Design a binder for this molecule. Structure first.
Ligand SMILES: Cc1cc2ccccc2[nH]c1=O
Length: 130
């Protein structure tokens, strides 16, 4: 229905706003664009499902997220990819892991404060009906 289309539109607006706030944070610059194959040639072979905040924005716009739960799976993917690809004890790896965890925690904290649980429940029930 039109009311359900309005619901998903509000969802997309909410998700774009959260994603923009993550993307403008200096700590998360490394997660804003896909990894350059020339800079890191073995990334595509190690990480089977690359994800980044520009890709998340594209997915929002392609109507790929019908719930905030599905959005958070891609945020979690950004984080887990970073922890997997940069597992070493050296400062470079520890910095990126710390930032990855901060991205995840920040996304979840914004959602905890600003997502109405009944709005999410409506989205899930529309999704489940389709
Ligand atoms: C996302 C990402 C980027 C990167 C760039 C250079 C070296 C290592 C890297 N690891 C990453 O996880």
């Amino acid at each position: 229905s039109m009311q359900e289309e309005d619901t998903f539109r509000e969802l997309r607006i909410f998700l774009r706003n959260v994603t923009h706030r993550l993307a403008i944070d200096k700590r998360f610059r490394v997660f804003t664009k896909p990894v350059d194959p020339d800079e890191v040639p073995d990334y595509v072979t190690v990480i089977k499902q690359p994800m980044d905040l520009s890709s998340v924005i594209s997915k929002i716009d392609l109507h790929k997220y019908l719930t905030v739960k599905d959005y958070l799976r891609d945020i979690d993917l950004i984080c887990s990819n970073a922890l997997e690809y940069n597992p070493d004890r050296d400062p470079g790896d520890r910095l990126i892991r710390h930032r990855a965890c901060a991205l995840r925690d920040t996304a979840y904290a914004i959602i905890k404060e600003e997502l109405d649980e009944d709005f999410e429940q409506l989205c899930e029930e529309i999704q489940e009906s389709r």
